[PDB]
Design goal:
heteropentamer; A: 21 strands; B: mainly alpha; 4 helices; elongated; magnesium (chain A)
Chain lengths: ~1350, ~70, ~50, ~100, ~55
């Protein structure tokens, strides 16, 4: 009834080109930035939006009397204009942030036992607010004004579905509209037409500018008065402001190519790091390699521009002549070198400049035409290396099977092998790499495997259901382009075509495609792939949207129809499940490989780029290994589809505006090859076969390693391939190391380049380069073992309303907390993190919550109502500090502070609730402004509950650590569950309607299954949840909830509905005032579990709170004694009463910038001591292996319990099709009686890293043996609640926050438990019979998400 | 070397057996699959077998359904 | 020690039969005539109907 | 006396010859036929002859693409890639006056 | 003296055929039309015995 077209507040997208060309062409009545068909069409049949903009700008000042400069050229006007000074408001926010951070630091120092000399500059007066250097204000006033303008636009566009907002700003009068915008400069007499993208990107630019200059100003202001408190970086704010202005001027002068020329900045910075950390033999090589390419781009620029500008309104303008652009490059690399004063932490922090300047105006069909010439080439191959690749692939597979399975992968014919490979067949082992030279690979390539694996029969809906744009079919394509941009013939033929095809094949959204289907049959893919009905798919098309990323002028994202994209996703899934392992390099990358393990034998490295790599591949190159994978997987053609179907079809580049230069023919295969189309794409698309191309890029390193006799390893952080080479020279005593490493590096480089040239890639000089150590493992600059951070990359865009689907203060604040905490996890200066957090949380709460686009003053009236509630509760006299007390409070208690006190010392934890409780406890203990008997009444208020409600257990199953009785803050997933079930119910997909009507019945029946159990182990309930099919359905629901338009899936509106608007408003309204809700009653009749140490035991309050919101159901396992309150600290030297001790290895005042002898501290839970099955694990899909693990975990968590065996039998019967006594041997047999500690499972962390990096962690050695006399004398030898991995990680964070605050690090410090806070967990005895029947119906109606039924394997 | 003179015959012909399998795989691609000879040039891969088996035995079970 | 003398030779014959079977397919699509390229497709379509 | 053993050493060189063919054997990959119609099937050929055929069948910029990518290559010896004379201005300007 | 001087004869008579057909770098479509079916039904035998045992 009421739709909304709410624009976004940050970029969240891409800057287009054709939209800007059309917005120019319409108003100019002359081609703008091009003369392509876009111009002609726009000028001829202009669309409603640009016609309303034409009318508005015609009523406003004339176009014809101004010099219409492109939008890029006005950056030096926009970033140099001035609007009425908002520095009073900067100072106000900074003072409030300083006060809040003083509170937080007092909270820290209290339990850390710190103190000072009663000095007013205790820590937080080095930042003299009155002395702001004014280089941040020049960006902050610009940004406040621009954001106010954009917020006015949003507010008026939520009301009117289309509006033209004309706003003055200094000498720059803007005009905004959802689809177009214009800028006129009364000072310079020049107009620029552009769109929202390129309007709010100068806003993200100025925001990142401000929070990057401010975060270094605070750092140097704290480093001039205490070395170590600030980030380890010395950047000159004036110098970097000069850098910004200079490159903004060069970007103004070069129209749209200073971005492709700023891409060199990263190379320059890497070359400077190499000059610092190596000798000339490599730094001068990388420098001379990149400088030549930079100079070549610079010369070519002029010609590029004059080609682009022909027949346009800028041929009567002129392009900067060489020497001035060279002087500007000189000034800006002078700046990038003076900022980097030989320092590998300055150079590390400098990386933000890539994204700072702004994203380029990516042209839609020019990247595509550029890569045409690269895609259409014939490439000569060498059959010898081509088969050596196959041999290496086979060898990796064989090593994988030998390691995992202990048997040889089944082979069709055992006669294609020599006697060597036959006896190795009977040996089951794999020749060490000194052997297997060429001929061995050549004869290994002759093998044909049998079907060892198997394709899943049913379509995994959890996989196929993921929100991505889907290209329309071939015949029904023109609907992506407006109805005014097409001829009448094509229009009629489209209007009549659209009635032959079903409603499924009109959508450009996967969820709509699979909901609005009438005839969906989960078994279809097993027929489709086998019968090969895609090899000539005539309703097949490939749309290249040109969605891309920072600082480059092309990355073309594909869009394919649904039939095809099920095949792409299937191949990728099957690879990731079966063929990706057997290959350590590529799955191990993110989380194990680089961090902990990689860290005369001539040693060296290569950093070769593989970003523009997908365009060099052919079928004759890729099918060699794709067919091996396909033989293992068991079908004719499944992995080579990208090269089989693509060359027939046509690339469109189907952006909303840009049409093709049609002549009046409807079949795209007929159209003559345009600039925006080309049929024969002989190559490979980006991201469609990435795993297989990384597999052949790794498998060639083995070929090279056997041709040579070195030891090569590879690491692939994302887009690149980084190789490490190690070769004993056995030639020494002359040139000792550097010429040896250099000649080894050059030889290896030549060999790798020849290996790639024999396959078809023309590796460039400026992409690949050389170094001795690999300095680029995951884009973190490690040198000599110390990991120099890149702290400010994430804190650039931490302004208000970040990462939100709808404007929700809770999620915005949580995102700010999560980004900014990287200046504590990756970065130092926790003080900087507290300041740049509180500044923006203040701007979100007390200055931006008033003008909320959806609810208006509702939010602020609510916040001032819980502010008056808390004031009247805690008896505060001044309102200036009640916002401080409300903002130093966790989110789960309705106060805005999304950094819990545990997040600042150990990243992960059980019992968030109790950690928050201890946080607020220490806050109220240190806050010597309130009166006592209220800091103790707050807890009675927390405990005074209205518990007599439903004891629903699905809440615990979905979040084992939850409170209930309306205390838990409702999230989008729960609040939208009943709306998305309601909408799913009316869906022509019989399967989904049938599962969704049953959703609420299964959800109310699951609880029953373990209602009458004592004690309720919520992690056991989580296991019972994962074992059932319901989990996947709940995950699908959670995925389709967070879409920003929930109740318009079955309707082409692309708009938000008033129902969802009101729902989100009610959520953020009834979530903030939770503090008033829990402070409205106060019961006095609770003896509080107080201590006789001066503090409260938080575990005896959290347990009672949970049991009382739970009906006293005796939840056993979920709570952990917080390290913050019990384990107190005292600094000392090797003398104490047997507390857990932490000692430093050095004698330097500070403990930074070093790696010590140790191997780092990461805390492994030591979970699941596994007597793993030794039967085949191959033929079972990941889904089935997970299910088996869950059933075994049930068999272990519940033992001797009634009905458990019948429960498992029914579960098996429904999920897998088999019984439980015929799958018993396949399960994992655990042997332990401490499943509480052991059974690390989802929603239970299995690692306990500290809040410091590895290099800071490599300088502390710990002993915990002295605590076992206390533990074993008070408590029995049975296990203890406390988690010493977390304790020791918090002690190392203590040593870090202490070295940072005071520059004298303790030589040793000991942490002592107080055992009144810590309890014990004896392994319980479950007393209660399950309800089992209900599982039968639950699997009768959630069977579509169940795994495939095993007919006969065991 | 009466028996060591033909082990290098077997190995040196297995090498060309492998180079020939590779050349077949490279010469069976978009161009054979445009017309329908890629499947014969590669061979049957134990799933089309199961498809024809199931369809043939469904048509053979459907004889008893009259 | 009867693997070095006759087993190597019957294995060579088997390997050679497989070599010839490959070499007989290597020259159909691109070495052979485009008119006879389409010959085997009707066998690949009839095999769906040729098996009980 | 003569045709009981020499046949082995003859077929040895016969199939080594076969390898002499195969090893250097080259495969041009599939492409248009340069009329913008039809995917030209792969070429099983010796490098030189296939380079000549392809060079004579290709048109426009593509010919320069193939001539630079295949006939040319990255001639590198003993590293230390010479800074081009035009970039020497950017390098003296950058590493001076700082 | 029963097979060692019999197998080599067939071997040497096949080698020349092999290099004769390799020097080309009508009757073969039939050869592969039988070559595929030769294993298609030998493997259907085992794919069905997996249904049977």
């Amino acid at each position: 009834t009421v739709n909304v077209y709410l624009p976004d507040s940050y970029l969240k997208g891409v800057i287009s080109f054709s939209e800007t060309n059309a917005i120019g062409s319409c108003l100019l009545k002359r081609p703008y930035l091009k003369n392509d068909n876009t111009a002609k069409v726009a000028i001829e049949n202009p669309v409603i939006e640009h016609v309303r903009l034409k009318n508005a700008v015609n009523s406003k000042m004339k176009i014809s009397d101004y010099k219409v400069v492109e939008p890029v050229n006005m950056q030096h006007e926009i970033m140099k204009n001035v609007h009425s000074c908002e520095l009073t408001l900067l100072k106000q926010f900074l003072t409030r942030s300083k006060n809040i951070s003083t509170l937080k630091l007092n909270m820290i120092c209290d339990w850390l036992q710190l103190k000072s000399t009663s000095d007013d500059t205790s820590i937080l007066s080095f930042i003299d607010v009155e002395f702001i250097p004014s280089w941040v204000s020049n960006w902050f006033s610009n940004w406040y004004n621009l954001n106010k303008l954009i917020l006015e636009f949003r507010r008026e566009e939520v009301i009117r579905t289309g509006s033209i907002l004309c706003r003055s700003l200094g000498k720059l009068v803007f005009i905004v509209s959802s689809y177009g915008c214009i800028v006129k400069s009364n000072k310079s007499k020049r107009v620029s037409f552009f769109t929202y993208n390129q309007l709010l990107t100068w806003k993200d630019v100025m925001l990142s500018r401000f929070n990057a200059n401010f975060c270094i100003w605070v750092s140097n202001s704290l480093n001039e008065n205490q070395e170590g408190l600030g980030l380890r970086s010395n950047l000159q704010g004036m110098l970097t402001n000069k850098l910004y202005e200079t490159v903004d001027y060069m970007l103004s002068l070069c129209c749209n190519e200073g971005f492709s020329l700023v891409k060199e900045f990263e190379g320059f910075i890497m070359s400077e790091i190499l000059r610092i950390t190596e000798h000339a033999q490599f730094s001068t090589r990388f420098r001379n390699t990149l400088l030549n390419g930079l100079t070549d781009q610079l010369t070519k620029l002029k010609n590029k521009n004059r080609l682009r500008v022909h027949s346009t309104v800028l041929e009567n303008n002129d392009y900067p002549m060489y020497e001035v652009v060279l002087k500007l490059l000189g000034d800006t690399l002078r700046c990038i070198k003076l900022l980097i004063n030989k320092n590998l932490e300055n150079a590390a922090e400098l990386y933000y400049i890539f994204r700072i300047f702004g994203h380029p105006m990516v042209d839609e069909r020019d990247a595509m035409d550029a890569v045409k010439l690269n895609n259409e080439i014939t490439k000569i191959l060498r059959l010898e290396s081509l088969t050596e690749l196959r041999g290496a692939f086979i060898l990796r597979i064989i090593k994988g099977f030998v390691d995992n399975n202990k048997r040889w992968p089944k082979i069709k014919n055992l006669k294609v092998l020599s006697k060597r490979w036959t006896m190795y067949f009977k040996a089951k082992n794999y020749p060490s790499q000194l052997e297997l030279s060429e001929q061995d690979f050549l004869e290994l390539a002759a093998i044909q495997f049998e079907q060892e694996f198997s394709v899943p029969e049913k379509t995994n809906l959890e996989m196929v259901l993921n929100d991505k744009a889907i290209s329309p079919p071939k015949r029904l394509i023109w609907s992506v382009y407006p109805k005014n941009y097409l001829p009448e013939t094509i229009k009629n033929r489209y209007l009549e075509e659209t009635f032959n095809a079903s409603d499924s094949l009109k959508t450009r959204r996967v969820l709509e495609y699979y909901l609005k289907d009438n005839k969906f049959d989960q078994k279809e893919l097993k027929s489709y792939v086998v019968r090969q009905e895609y090899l000539n798919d005539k309703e097949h098309i490939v749309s290249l949207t040109g969605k891309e990323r920072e600082l480059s002028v092309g990355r073309m994202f594909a869009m394919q129809p649904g039939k095809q994209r099920q095949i792409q996703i299937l191949a990728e899934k099957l690879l990731a499940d079966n063929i990706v392992p057997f290959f350590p390099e590529t799955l191990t990358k993110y989380g194990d490989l680089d961090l902990q393990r990689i860290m005369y034998i001539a040693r060296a490295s290569i950093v070769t780029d593989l970003s523009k790599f997908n365009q060099a591949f052919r079928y004759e190159t890729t099918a060699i290994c794709a067919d091996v994978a396909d033989e293992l997987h068991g079908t004719q053609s499944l992995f080579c589809w990208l090269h089989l179907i693509v060359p027939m079809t046509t690339m469109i580049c189907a952006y909303r505006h840009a049409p093709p230069e049609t002549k009046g023919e409807y079949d795209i295969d007929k159209i003559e090859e345009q600039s925006g189309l080309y049929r024969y794409h002989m190559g490979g698309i980006e991201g469609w076969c990435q795993k297989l191309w990384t597999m052949e890029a790794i498998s060639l390193l083995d070929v090279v390693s056997v041709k040579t006799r070195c030891q090569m390893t590879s690491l692939l952080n994302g887009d690149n391939q980084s190789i490490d080479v190690s070769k004993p020279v056995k030639l020494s005593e002359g040139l000792d190391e550097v010429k040896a490493d250099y000649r080894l590096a050059v030889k290896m480089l030549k060999e790798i380049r020849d290996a790639y040239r024999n396959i078809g890639h023309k590796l460039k000089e400026g992409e690949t380069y050389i170094s001795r150590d690999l300095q680029f493992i995951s884009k973190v600059i490690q040198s000599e073992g110390v990991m120099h951070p890149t702290p400010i990359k994430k804190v650039l865009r931490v302004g208000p309303w970040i990462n939100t689907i709808l404007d929700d203060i809770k999620t915005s604040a949580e995102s700010i907390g999560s980004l900014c905490q990287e200046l504590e996890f990756r970065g130092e200066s926790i003080i900087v993190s507290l300041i740049l957090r509180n500044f923006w949380l203040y701007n979100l709460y007390m200055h931006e919550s008033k003008q909320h686009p959806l609810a208006g003053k509702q939010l602020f009236k609510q916040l001032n109502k819980t502010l008056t509630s808390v004031q009247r509760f805690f008896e505060i006299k001044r309102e200036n500090e009640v916002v401080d007390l409300w903002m130093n409070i966790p989110m789960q208690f309705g106060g805005g502070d999304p950094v819990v006190f545990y997040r600042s010392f150990y990243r992960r934890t059980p019992d968030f609730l109790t950690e928050a409780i201890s946080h607020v406890d220490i806050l109220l203990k240190i806050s010597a402004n309130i009166k006592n008997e209220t800091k103790v009444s707050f807890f009675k208020a927390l405990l005074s509950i209205e518990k007599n409600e439903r004891a629903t257990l699905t809440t615990l199953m979905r979040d084992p650590q939850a409170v209930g009785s309306e205390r838990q803050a409702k999230v989008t997933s729960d609040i939208n569950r009943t709306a998305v079930t309601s909408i799913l119910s009316l869906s022509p997909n019989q399967l989904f309607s049938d599962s969704a009507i049953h959703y609420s019945r299964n959800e109310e029946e699951v609880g029953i299954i373990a209602e009458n159990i004592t004690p309720v182990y919520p992690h056991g309930l989580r296991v019972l949840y994962e074992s059932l099919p319901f989990h996947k359905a709940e995950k699908v629901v959670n995925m389709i909830s967070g879409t920003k338009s929930i109740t318009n899936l079955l309707q082409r509106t692309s708009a938000i509905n008033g129902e969802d608007i009101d729902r989100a408003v009610s959520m953020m309204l009834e979530n903030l005032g939770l503090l008033s809700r829990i402070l409205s009653v106060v019961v006095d009749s609770i003896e509080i579990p107080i201590k006789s140490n001066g503090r409260l035991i938080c575990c005896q309050i959290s347990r009672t709170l949970r049991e009382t919101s739970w009906n006293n159901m005796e939840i056993v396992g979920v709570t952990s004694p917080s390290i913050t309150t019990c384990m107190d600290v005292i600094y000392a030297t090797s003398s104490h009463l047997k507390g857990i001790i932490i000692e430093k290895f050095s004698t330097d005042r500070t403990t930074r910038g070093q790696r010590g002898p140790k191997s780092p501290w990461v805390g492994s839970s030591t979970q699941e001591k596994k007597l793993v099955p030794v039967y085949n694990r191959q033929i079972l899909s990941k889904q089935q292996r997970e299910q088996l693990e869950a059933i075994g975990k049930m068999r272990w968590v519940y033992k001797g319990t009634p009905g458990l065996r019948r429960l498992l039998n029914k579960i098996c019967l429904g999920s897998l099709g088999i019984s439980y006594k015929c799958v018993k041997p396949l399960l994992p047999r655990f042997m332990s009686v401490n499943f509480l500690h052991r059974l690390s499972v989802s929603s239970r962390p299995m690692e306990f890293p500290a809040s410091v990096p590895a290099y800071r962690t490599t300088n502390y050695h710990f002993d915990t043996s002295p605590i076992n006399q206390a533990l074993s004398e008070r408590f029995g030898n049975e296990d203890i609640n406390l988690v010493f991995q977390n304790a020791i990680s918090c002690g190392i964070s203590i040593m870090s926050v202490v070295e940072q605050l005071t520059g004298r690090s303790p030589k040793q410090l000991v942490l002592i438990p107080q055992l009144e806070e810590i309890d014990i967990m004896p392994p319980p005895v479950f007393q209660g019979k399950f309800n089992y029947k209900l599982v039968d119906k639950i699997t009768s109606d959630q069977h579509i998400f169940s795994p495939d039924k095993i007919d006969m394997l065991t | 070397s009466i028996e060591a003179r033909l082990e290098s015959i077997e190995e040196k012909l297995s090498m060309i057996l492998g180079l020939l399998r590779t050349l077949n795989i490279a010469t069976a691609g978009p161009t054979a699959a445009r017309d329908g000879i890629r499947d014969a040039m590669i061979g049957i891969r134990e799933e089309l077998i199961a498809d024809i088996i199931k369809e043939a035995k469904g048509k053979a079970a459907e004889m008893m359904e009259e």
